[PDB]
């Protein structure tokens, strides 16, 4: 059994050894078992077949990445969303229009959003400095 | 014993006193308010079994 | 001035409301950050010069 | 003054007391959880590296555009910034830093451009007038690779179209929760690896369909994670700071208390001189 | 005298629902001041709205103030009151907008006035 | 005596910008004690620091204080002084540290102060 | 009584400031919200009608 990792950009989403595993990879479906010659390719969204050592299946979904099979290390670094070209130009677009419009939305942060409120409130005419003659 | 409000028994107190020209103090308060609740509360007192069987002349003994 | 000025009341009522933010004017969003900029500008409109008293007919002008 | 204003401005100090002492424990925990996402983030490029590095310039080398330092006509700038005040100064003293590298830039006359993440530096850049070209804001404290994609996507084309010649990410950096410092760090053309991968000579990559297409792609993932780890770092460097602005707020509250109260009972005393001083000496 | 014992159970409870509205709504104000009106729950929005509509519909025309307004003033039973705020916070009249209520009377004259807008 | 008509519409106007000025920098001077100057909008930490150069250029040295400071007096012309306050207030002098102003006569004094440090 | 309510005093004192600083921090650690979920239940136990007083029995009871 070999080491495989699968990692996206964010989070790892799997470790541990491995007996095989079965790709879809991008010139065509792929199998990599134990001590594979190196290889580097693209994979295609789908799903990934592990057989965790003691025959342990299972499958994960991934939306795509790169696959690399080293001697002795295989790692797929997947991602997180799909990737292509018609829909990375539409997010291009879309910032290109949103700092163009001068669109700006808010955070979600309703905690900060509250805290700060009643920060604010309770610091108006509040007139302490002129009262307390600290000098300044 | 309940006293429904010591509040109004000192303002009562305050008139009785300012209406017989006696000096005030804080908050125009007659000068010895602290004395008239302390020798008022200081009768709600527990008292020993020797206490109320002297004045009582025996009559009593057990209790207190 | 009866019609006019009820207008005057509300924005600068809300102003009021909102004039707690006005250090904070950046984070607001801009549904609230339009009122805040109308009451600043009828503050603004308030101050008068001495000794230049305007006809009724000047004020209901710039109030509408 | 007299003792009723002054009580309820004790009053309202303490109530601020009290909000800044929450905001400070919610800024600790949120700080612990944004270092955890950032550790999480390095495998990905810590191993994306090695592979760009032993495809581009190992014993076999590759020409892409993205490795050589051509000519600079003009440079492009991602500025990471948070979507939240009360960070203390940690946004404006990068913007400084911005500020005085766009003006060296200028001074050659190599143009400049800005891209922009988070809204605190979208006002920031439309205030001064800087060239702001693409922008994501409102991620908050839940940043996603997925929304990183637009802005780089725009640098990106812009540096193979032949329109940047120099890109740069600019975001703070968590050293130690106590100090943070603004970087400014290049990724565009991508700088030179410290380690050599010499020994790694006796093997070499079985390449489908060819390394060319794949050295794009690799590149590209690895410029969207290093931006995106910018990303996370920024953030818990926010946290780091606002919980110190937060220690820092509520000892002055309650330092400025004790003034208050000082204020406080001397006007409570001349007021009980005044009224029974005007009783007594009224009367007779 | 606001205990169920002497009003009855329908008008405390509309009492104190009326009053947990506006309660709600006050605590909404400053994250729709800060946040905006667009980021809140699908559930508060509606608090939103039905606390405005509640808020307007306490005001009411008097007799003795026809002579500041010039409009007509009204009368209404303590019946109509409950009635009609009690439908208001079930979203009866989620369908009115909120100038439907200001100054209208009893709960009538608001889909009266609706008609009108 | 500080009218438009007695002093004319330059010194009037100087003076008010002035008390203006100071006036926004006293209504600030709390949030700055609790939160810190870093949370001052950008535009109220230029109002900030043009108060504290108005408030350093208001001191003078006197000729009948030379025996506490030993610095020699200054007597200043008011064309001198609407003219300095004229420009720390319109920003000519915006590029200037503070300590430039204390105890100068004349903005000339200030401006060849500043190269001292 | 005195073995069945030696913590409530101490719990609810401590409770009501954490209800305070819960206002503002949301996504509380599971730690503390079992506490402020406790410290509520008790809360709303202690409440109790105008006229139904009860006896050790049932208040020793409804505290165990």
Same mark, same amino acid.
């Given at each position: ?51 965790? %050592? ?15 099979? %080293? ?42 959003? %509250? ?22 | 014993?309940?006293? @429904? @409000? ?25 000068? @010895? ?32 | ?64 | ?157 812009? *540096? ?7 890109? *740069? ?37 079985? *390449? ?55 204020? *406080? ?20 | ?117």
């Amino acid at each position: 059994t070999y080491h495989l990792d699968v990692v996206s950009a964010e989070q790892q989403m799997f470790s541990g050894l491995v007996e095989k595993i079965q790709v879809t990879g991008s010139e065509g479906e792929l199998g990599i078992y134990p001590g594979h010659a190196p290889l580097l390719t693209a994979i295609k969204p789908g799903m990934i077949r592990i057989v965790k %050592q003691h025959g342990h299946e299972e499958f994960i979904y991934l939306s795509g990445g790169i696959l690399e099979v %080293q001697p002795g290390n295989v790692t797929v670094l997947a991602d997180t969303a799909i990737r292509g070209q018609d829909l990375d130009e539409a997010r291009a677009m879309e910032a290109k229009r949103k700092a163009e419009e001068h669109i700006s939305s808010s955070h979600g942060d309703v905690d900060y959003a %509250q805290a700060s409120a009643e920060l604010a409130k309770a610091i108006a005419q509040l007139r302490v400095i002129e009262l307390t003659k600290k000098a300044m | 014993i309940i006293y @429904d @409000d010591l509040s109004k028994q000192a303002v009562a107190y305050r008139q009785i006193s300012l209406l017989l020209r006696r000096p005030p103090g804080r908050e125009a308060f007659p000068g @010895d308010v602290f004395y008239l609740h302390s020798r008022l509360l200081e009768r709600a007192a527990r008292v020993n079994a020797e206490y109320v069987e002297a004045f009582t002349k025996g009559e009593v003994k057990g209790k207190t | 001035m009866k019609k006019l000025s009820g207008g005057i009341r509300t924005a600068l009522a809300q102003y009021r409301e909102l004039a707690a933010f006005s250090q904070f004017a950046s984070d607001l969003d801009d549904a609230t950050r339009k009122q805040l900029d109308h009451g600043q500008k009828v503050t603004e409109l308030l101050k008068q010069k001495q000794y230049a008293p305007m006809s009724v007919a000047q004020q209901s002008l710039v109030l509408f | 003054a007299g003792a009723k204003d002054i009580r309820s401005k004790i009053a309202s100090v303490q109530n601020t007391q009290k909000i800044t002492k929450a905001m400070e424990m919610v800024a600790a925990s949120k700080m612990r959880k944004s270092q955890d996402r950032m550790a999480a983030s390095r495998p990905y490029a810590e191993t994306m590296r090695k592979v760009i590095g032993h495809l581009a310039h190992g014993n076999l080398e590759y020409k892409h555009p993205y490795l050589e330092d051509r000519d600079v006509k003009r440079v492009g700038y991602l500025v990471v910034s948070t979507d939240r005040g009360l960070a203390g100064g940690l946004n404006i003293n990068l913007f400084k830093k911005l500020l005085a590298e766009m003006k060296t830039w200028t001074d050659k006359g190599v143009q400049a451009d800005l891209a922009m993440i988070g809204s605190k530096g979208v006002s920031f850049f439309n205030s001064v007038g800087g060239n702001v070209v693409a922008q994501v804001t409102g991620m908050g404290d839940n940043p996603s690779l997925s929304e990183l994609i637009g802005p780089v996507k725009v640098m990106l084309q812009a *540096y193979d179209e032949g329109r940047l010649d120099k890109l *740069y990410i600019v975001s703070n950096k968590f050293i130690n929760t106590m100090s943070q410092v603004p970087t400014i760090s290049q990724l565009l053309p991508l700088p030179a690896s410290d380690d050599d991968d010499l020994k790694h000579k006796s093997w070499d990559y079985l *390449y489908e369909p060819d390394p060319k297409a794949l050295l794009d792609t690799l590149l590209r993932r690895y410029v969207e994670s290093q931006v995106y780890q910018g990303v996370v770092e920024n953030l818990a460097s926010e946290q780091a700071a606002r919980m110190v602005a937060m220690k820092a707020a509520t000892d002055n509250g309650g330092s400025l208390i004790k003034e208050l109260q000082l204020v *406080y009972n001397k006007a409570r005393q001349a007021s009980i001189t005044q009224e029974l001083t005007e009783i007594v000496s009224g009367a007779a | 005298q606001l205990d169920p014992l002497v009003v009855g159970q329908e008008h405390y409870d509309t009492a104190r629902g009326v009053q947990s509205i506006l309660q709600r709504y006050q605590e909404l104000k400053d994250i729709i001041a800060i946040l905006g009106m667009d980021e809140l729950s699908e559930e508060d929005k509606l608090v939103v709205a039905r606390a405005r509509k509640i808020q307007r519909f306490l005001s009411q025309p008097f007799f003795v103030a026809e002579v500041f307004t010039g409009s007509p003033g009204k009368y209404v039973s303590l019946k109509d009151t409950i009635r009609g705020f009690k439908g208001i916070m079930e979203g009866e009249y989620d369908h009115l907008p909120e100038q439907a209520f200001y100054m209208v009377g009893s709960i009538e004259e608001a889909v009266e006035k609706a008609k009108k807008l």
